[PDB]
């Protein structure tokens, strides 16, 4: 009952209706009452979470025991396990409770579970003053989460730029790696935040390829960055043969994601005229091994009179982005079977349910052997 009324007032900040409660309570008892989880979070935690001062200096003045107690916090529908009170504070955008929870001593870099900082948590949602007041209080910008993404990188991804230039003049290391290779330039690649890009490049950070053996340059055509495309395709670090891969695969991805298919083909004639732009330096399609049976045996089209009618035969089209993306990609990396799947759905909303099996019966297998 009481350890319950106690838990609701400091969640929903009713300090009048809270100090009624424990009127007649001794202070041993009150430390209890306050110490005790409620829905996998601390009485702190919920009056840190939803910003309630007050509530947060009161509680704290009771016992400073629950300030590194991590517990269970809503974020966008997602639980979040092991969150201290600093790191809830922060991660939901309420500056003075996370000034009161630092002058009480709480530690500047106690992470939940995933290893987040608070650091890390303020630079998701994009709160600059927050990420200021926490560098300024010793905050690791290098602590990164368990899966090696840093402060930087989560900065890059959401678009912040002024996040990341403070980061940046900071001392944040630019060429750190996720464990699968992610760089704050991948970041940049699949946001489409071109200015970060360009910012992070004046911090000298190097194009590297990363786990699935994708450069910046082709994470932006995969994810359909055309404005990514267009800058690291004029860019001096990207030779011929990257830059005609880069918009052939962005060509598949305008076929596949943007169901835009005249905008399609402007890439693969531009590419396709990159490839014989020089008689002493021609850059021929690779032949893939075998025909397979899930692409009605298709073949990548190999010269500009190839490319010419295909406007007027979209199946077609759907085969070649397949085919590109197969080439370019390989079958290791998420997205090949992700469009061969997406494909057969499409055909089954037309009322082709063979070609969907057909379609699905090879991206399982391709799945599996992953």
Same mark, same amino acid.
């Given at each position: 009952?009481? +350890?319950?009324?106690?838990?609701?007032?400091?969640?929903?900040?009713?300090?009048?209706?809270?100090?009624?409660?424990?009127?007649?309570?001794?202070?041993?008892?009150?430390?209890?009452?306050?110490? @005790?989880?409620?829905?996998?979070? !601390?009485?702190?935690?919920? &009056?840190?979470?939803?910003?309630?001062?007050?509530?947060?200096?009161?509680?704290?003045?009771?016992?400073?025991?629950?300030?590194?107690?991590?517990?269970?916090?809503?974020?966008?529908?997602?639980?979040?396990?092991?969150?201290?009170?600093?790191?809830?504070?922060? &991660?939901?955008?309420?500056?003075?409770?996370?000034?009161?929870?630092?002058?009480?001593?709480?530690?500047?870099?106690? !992470?939940?579970?995933?290893?987040?900082?608070?650091?890390?948590?303020?630079?998701?949602?994009?709160?600059?003053?927050?990420?200021?007041?926490?560098?300024?209080?010793?905050?690791?910008?290098?602590?990164?989460?368990?899966?090696?993404?840093?402060?930087?990188?989560?900065?890059?991804?959401?678009?912040?730029?002024?996040?990341? *230039?403070?980061?940046?003049? +900071?001392?944040?290391?630019?060429?750190?790696?996720?464990?699968?290779?992610?760089?704050?330039?991948?970041?940049?690649?699949?946001?489409?935040?071109?200015?970060?890009? +360009?910012?992070?490049?004046?911090?000298?950070?190097?194009?590297?390829?990363?786990?699935?053996?994708?450069?910046?340059?082709?994470?932006?055509?995969?994810?359909?960055?055309?404005?990514?495309?267009?800058?690291?395709?004029?860019?001096?670090?990207?030779?011929? !043969?990257?830059?005609?891969?880069?918009?052939?695969?962005?060509?598949?991805?305008?076929?596949?994601?943007?169901?835009?298919?005249?905008?399609?083909?402007?890439?693969?004639?531009?590419?396709?005229?990159?490839?014989?732009?020089?008689?002493?330096?021609?850059?021929?399609?690779?032949?893939? *091994?075998?025909?397979?049976? &899930?692409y009605?045996?298709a073949?990548e089209?190999?010269?500009?009179?190839?490319? @010419?009618?295909?406007?007027?035969?979209?199946?077609?089209?759907?085969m070649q982005?397949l085919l590109i993306?197969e080439r370019?990609?390989?079958?290791?990396?998420?997205?090949?079977?992700?469009?061969?799947?997406?494909?057969?759905?499409?055909?089954?909303?037309?009322?082709?349910?063979?070609?969907?099996?057909?379609?699905?019966?090879?991206?399982?297998?391709?799945? *599996?052997?992953?």
């Open positions: 009952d009481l +350890k319950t009324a106690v838990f609701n007032a400091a969640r929903d900040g009713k300090l009048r209706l809270l100090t009624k409660l424990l009127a007649s309570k001794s202070k041993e008892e009150v430390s209890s009452l306050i110490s @005790e989880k409620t829905n996998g979070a !601390t009485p702190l935690l919920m &009056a840190a979470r939803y910003g309630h001062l007050d509530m947060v200096e009161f509680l704290l003045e009771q016992c400073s025991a629950s300030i590194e107690v991590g517990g269970s916090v809503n974020f966008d529908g997602e639980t979040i396990e092991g969150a201290p009170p600093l790191w809830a504070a922060s &991660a939901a955008g309420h500056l003075k409770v996370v000034q009161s929870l630092l002058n009480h001593g709480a530690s500047v870099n106690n !992470t939940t579970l995933t290893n987040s900082t608070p650091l890390r948590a303020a630079c998701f949602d994009g709160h600059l003053e927050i990420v200021k007041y926490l560098v300024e209080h010793k905050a690791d910008l290098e602590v990164s989460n368990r899966h090696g993404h840093t402060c930087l990188m989560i900065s890059c991804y959401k678009g912040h730029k002024e996040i990341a *230039q403070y980061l940046l003049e +900071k001392g944040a290391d630019v060429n750190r790696k996720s464990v699968k290779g992610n760089t704050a330039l991948h970041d940049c690649a699949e946001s489409g935040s071109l200015d970060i890009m +360009k910012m992070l490049l004046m911090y000298c950070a190097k194009m590297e390829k990363d786990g699935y053996g994708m450069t910046p340059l082709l994470s932006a055509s995969v994810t359909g960055h055309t404005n990514i495309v267009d800058f690291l395709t004029h860019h001096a670090q990207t030779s011929k !043969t990257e830059r005609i891969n880069a918009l052939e695969l962005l060509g598949a991805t305008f076929v596949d994601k943007k169901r835009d298919l005249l905008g399609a083909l402007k890439y693969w004639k531009k590419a396709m005229n990159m490839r014989y732009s020089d008689r002493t330096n021609i850059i021929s399609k690779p032949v893939p *091994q075998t025909l397979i049976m &899930a009605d045996y073949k089209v190999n010269s500009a009179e190839e490319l @010419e009618g295909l406007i007027a035969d979209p199946d077609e089209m759907r982005a993306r370019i990609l390989g079958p290791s990396h998420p997205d090949t079977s992700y469009y061969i799947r997406y494909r057969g759905a499409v055909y089954a909303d037309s009322g082709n349910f063979k070609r969907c099996i057909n379609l699905w019966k090879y991206a399982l297998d391709m799945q *599996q052997s992953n």
